[PDB]
Scaffold this motif. Structure first.
Motif, mmCIF file in Angstrom:
data_model
loop_
_atom_site.group_PDB
_atom_site.id
_atom_site.type_symbol
_atom_site.label_atom_id
_atom_site.label_comp_id
_atom_site.label_asym_id
_atom_site.label_seq_id
_atom_site.Cartn_x
_atom_site.Cartn_y
_atom_site.Cartn_z
ATOM 1 N N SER A 120 36.118 58.010 54.044
ATOM 2 C CA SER A 120 36.645 56.562 53.552
ATOM 3 C C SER A 120 38.263 56.548 53.264
ATOM 4 N N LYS A 121 38.849 55.599 53.702
ATOM 5 C CA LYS A 121 40.095 55.215 53.119
ATOM 6 C C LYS A 121 40.242 54.920 51.594
ATOM 7 N N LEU A 122 39.160 54.821 51.056
ATOM 8 C CA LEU A 122 39.042 54.530 49.566
ATOM 9 C C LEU A 122 38.818 55.957 48.733
ATOM 10 N N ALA A 123 38.342 56.764 49.357
ATOM 11 C CA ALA A 123 38.124 58.048 48.650
ATOM 12 C C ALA A 123 39.513 58.534 47.815
ATOM 13 N N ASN A 124 39.099 58.794 46.542
ATOM 14 C CA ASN A 124 40.238 59.228 45.639
ATOM 15 C C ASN A 124 41.065 58.336 45.179
ATOM 16 N N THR A 125 40.656 57.019 45.374
ATOM 17 C CA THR A 125 41.862 55.870 45.141
ATOM 18 C C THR A 125 41.563 54.960 43.766
ATOM 19 N N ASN A 126 42.293 54.352 43.205
ATOM 20 C CA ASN A 126 42.143 53.857 42.063
ATOM 21 C C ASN A 126 42.080 52.262 42.422
ATOM 22 N N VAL A 127 40.952 51.823 41.966
ATOM 23 C CA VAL A 127 40.572 50.363 42.347
ATOM 24 C C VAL A 127 40.321 49.624 41.020
ATOM 25 N N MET A 128 40.727 48.355 41.169
ATOM 26 C CA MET A 128 40.518 47.201 40.032
ATOM 27 C C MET A 128 39.475 46.247 40.816
ATOM 28 N N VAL A 129 38.259 46.007 39.912
ATOM 29 C CA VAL A 129 37.295 45.084 40.239
ATOM 30 C C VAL A 129 37.335 43.890 39.306
ATOM 31 N N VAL A 130 38.070 42.784 39.437
ATOM 32 C CA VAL A 130 38.064 41.692 38.717
ATOM 33 C C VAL A 130 36.559 41.022 39.034
ATOM 34 N N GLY A 131 35.941 40.720 37.943
ATOM 35 C CA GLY A 131 34.649 40.117 38.157
ATOM 36 C C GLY A 131 33.631 41.315 38.351
ATOM 37 N N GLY A 132 34.040 42.533 38.075
ATOM 38 C CA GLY A 132 33.169 43.573 38.298
ATOM 39 C C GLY A 132 31.834 43.873 37.669
ATOM 40 N N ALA A 133 31.361 43.173 36.667
ATOM 41 C CA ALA A 133 30.240 43.054 35.901
ATOM 42 C C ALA A 133 29.128 42.160 36.596
ATOM 43 N N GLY A 134 29.609 41.346 37.463
ATOM 44 C CA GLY A 134 28.849 40.397 38.028
ATOM 45 C C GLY A 134 27.884 40.675 39.159
ATOM 46 N N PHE A 135 27.267 39.855 39.887
ATOM 47 C CA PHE A 135 26.273 40.304 40.816
ATOM 48 C C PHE A 135 26.918 40.939 42.126
ATOM 49 N N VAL A 136 27.832 40.372 42.775
ATOM 50 C CA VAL A 136 28.310 41.133 43.909
ATOM 51 C C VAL A 136 29.502 42.303 43.502
ATOM 52 N N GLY A 137 29.976 42.061 41.982
ATOM 53 C CA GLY A 137 30.774 42.997 41.682
ATOM 54 C C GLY A 137 30.136 44.327 41.458
ATOM 55 N N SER A 138 29.158 44.315 40.705
ATOM 56 C CA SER A 138 28.364 45.496 40.286
ATOM 57 C C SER A 138 27.783 46.253 41.300
#
Ligand SMILES: NC(=O)c1ccc[n+]([C@@H]2O[C@H](COP(=O)([O-])OP(=O)(O)OC[C@H]3O[C@@H](n4cnc5c(N)ncnc54)[C@H](O)[C@@H]3O)[C@@H](O)[C@H]2O)c1
Ligand SMILES: NC(=O)c1ccc[n+]([C@@H]2O[C@H](COP(=O)([O-])OP(=O)(O)OC[C@H]3O[C@@H](n4cnc5c(N)ncnc54)[C@H](O)[C@@H]3O)[C@@H](O)[C@H]2O)c1
Lengths: 330, 330
Positions: free
Chosen positions: A1-19
């Motif tokens: 995956s292009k996302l392997a070993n990346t730093n990601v921010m999830v705004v709203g990450g405790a929500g339904f879709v976010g979690s």
């Protein structure tokens, strides 16, 4: 995956879709997930206790938090909203703060960050960029659209690598009835038709159908939505928009029928036949350009959602019960 | 007039269009005008010292002011904005506060008022209610559109009697170069082509034409705009929109030519012929439904504007000079 070993921010990450997105990001081997969530419509138990997860229990509109942010993110998922239509109508100012201003202040901060490869915005559901002033049943719907305006502007003006992901009628594990604070109306508890139906079926009660359940919707399983958001991040064209959709419609009568079959809820359903006047988003762009397809059937997704609801039913009930007093006086 | 003996609020009433609307309202025999204006892009001398004029030197977003408002207004003109495109690009958050949130907080307060016959919103320029996400050169342009979304919503949901008045390229007396505070860029001083050209012509200097002055615009005299806003108030359909427009285009080369002829500015103009590719709002609805027609010619309006500029030139210069230091360091 292009996302392997990346730093990601999830705004709203405790929500339904976010979690669910956070779970999947961790499965894909990201280096860090920074969840920013004020828990306005979410429960802390939906964040993980993970060494890779950093949780800021703060609004994304907080000036100190924004100024503290560093150019250390490869990807940003902006999933925050004021949940949902009914709440927004009750208090358009509470919606504005948590649905319009969120996007603007986030983008304004992110605009000079150089490590960002993609900023993915969850929009409301080929893809066109023309809108009517007259759609718009709620301040919620307007805030969603305003976020698209912002996403296009910040791309054009500042090369912010935005991708708008339009979806609708997500369902699955991690959507908790009554999650978060009271947002003014009974929809705080009864958030959406699918978890409401599942909860009531599990309690053995009649599913309330509106108008015989003739309305149809394109339901999409939350894990498909998480994968679609990730596809947008990895491969979506900056400035662009993609429908994240199943391309299949289910009537609320059939939704109810299936939930009853799976749960064993023996109670009556007042369903009516659907007529042409009862209902008078294409997934092709995402399929063609991102190789993304939302293939989880309504039958398989419902089973998974019911299984999760069953296993967490006591917890969900404790969460629902905090709104008893607000429910009774509404 | 339907506005005789009425109580009117003009949000943004110390500004260019606002001050001229206030003058006209007083001419029409209104009972009271409540000007609400933070003077962000305006001078106090543009308000009147009138027994009928009440001036609140406060943002319309101020919670105390909003809560203090009483259901004692027949008409509300919402003319506040963050002036203008260039400033908004410099600071989208300053724009949001003074251009998006203004409209939302105002309407939210006004929504249960029963004395209101019409709420008239100055929008950016038959009339259609379909918009592209891709128009939108600035946060200013987006804020203007968002105000239209709000105007339609508040009408549909709460019967707020909104009328959107779309205009563009207003010019006339009362537009003061450098009015208000520094909003980040030289456009704070050099606000618009017409007063910039008039000021420079009066000082005997060459008018700077961009690309030979091939761009055309539909200029409209501010007193016609004031009358058009009043027509919208009196007779405009709640939920509706009207172009307030001259229906006549003038090239910037011709604008410059006329200003030089009227002022006696003997200096050169680098003008080019207009080609089909240089430029590749109908007034009919307002004419038909409101009996409104913007009939002041570019030649007559320019004369009136120049006369006013001449008479107030020293004052305007003192106002321009407050930005000298910000200009020099830009
Ligand atoms: N679920 C759907 O059917 C659906 C459909 C279309 C679009 N969306 C969009 O998907 C996204 C996620 O929605 P969801 O269904 O998971 O709802 P949700 O309410 O579970 O998630 C949104 C999250 O945003 C958080 N939040 C609210 N204000 C915040 C703020 N100011 N700062 C930081 N966080 C804040 C909430 O606490 C919550 O955890 C939203 O942007 C929503 O509009 C959802
Ligand atoms: N002049 C034009 O060519 C033009 C064209 C199309 C639309 N408009 C619209 O016409 C209206 C008037 O614009 P103008 O040209 O007179 O500009 P202006 O800057 O002179 O007037 C706007 C006024 O709003 C005030 N204001 C700003 N923030 C405020 C706030 N938060 N609360 C209260 N007042 C606030 C300013 O101090 C100013 O007096 C605006 O809504 C503008 O977007 C103007």
């Amino acid at each position: 995956s292009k996302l392997a070993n990346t730093n990601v921010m999830v705004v709203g990450g405790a929500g339904f879709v976010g979690s669910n997105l956070v779970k999947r990001l961790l499965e894909l081997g990201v280096n860090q997930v920074h969840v920013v969530d004020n828990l306005l419509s979410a429960e802390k138990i939906n964040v993980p206790d993970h060494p890779a997860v950093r949780f800021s229990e703060t609004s994304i509109t907080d000036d100190a938090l924004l100024a503290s942010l560093q150019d250390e993110y490869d990807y940003v998922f902006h999933l925050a909203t004021y949940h949902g239509n009914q709440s927004s109508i009750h208090d358009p100012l509470a919606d504005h703060e948590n649905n319009t201003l969120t996007t603007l202040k986030l983008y304004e901060r992110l605009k000079h960050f150089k490590r960002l490869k993609k900023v993915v915005y969850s929009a409301a559901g080929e893809e066109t960029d023309i809108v009517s002033l007259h759609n718009n049943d709620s301040p919620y719907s307007m805030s969603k659209i305003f976020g698209e305006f912002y996403s296009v502007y910040y791309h054009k003006q500042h090369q912010l690598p935005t991708v708008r992901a339009r979806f609708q009628n997500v369902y699955g594990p991690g959507e908790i009835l009554g999650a978060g604070r009271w947002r003014g109306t009974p929809a705080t508890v009864w958030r959406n038709v699918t978890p409401t139906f599942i909860y009531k079926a599990l309690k053995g009660m009649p599913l309330p159908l509106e108008n015989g359940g003739v309305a149809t919707r394109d339901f999409i399983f939350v894990e498909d939505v998480a994968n679609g958001l990730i596809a947008c991040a990895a491969d979506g064209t900056p400035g662009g928009v993609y429908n994240i959709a199943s391309g299949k419609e289910t009537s609320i009568a059939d939704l109810a029928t299936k939930i009853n079959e799976i749960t064993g809820n023996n109670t009556e359903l007042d369903r009516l036949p659907k007529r042409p006047w009862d209902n008078s988003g294409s997934p092709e762009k995402a399929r063609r350009e991102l190789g993304f397809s939302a293939d989880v059937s309504i039958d398989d997704g419902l089973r998974k959602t019911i299984e999760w609801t069953k296993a967490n039913l006591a917890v969900i009930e404790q969460i629902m019960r905090k709104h008893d007093s607000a429910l009774a006086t509404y």
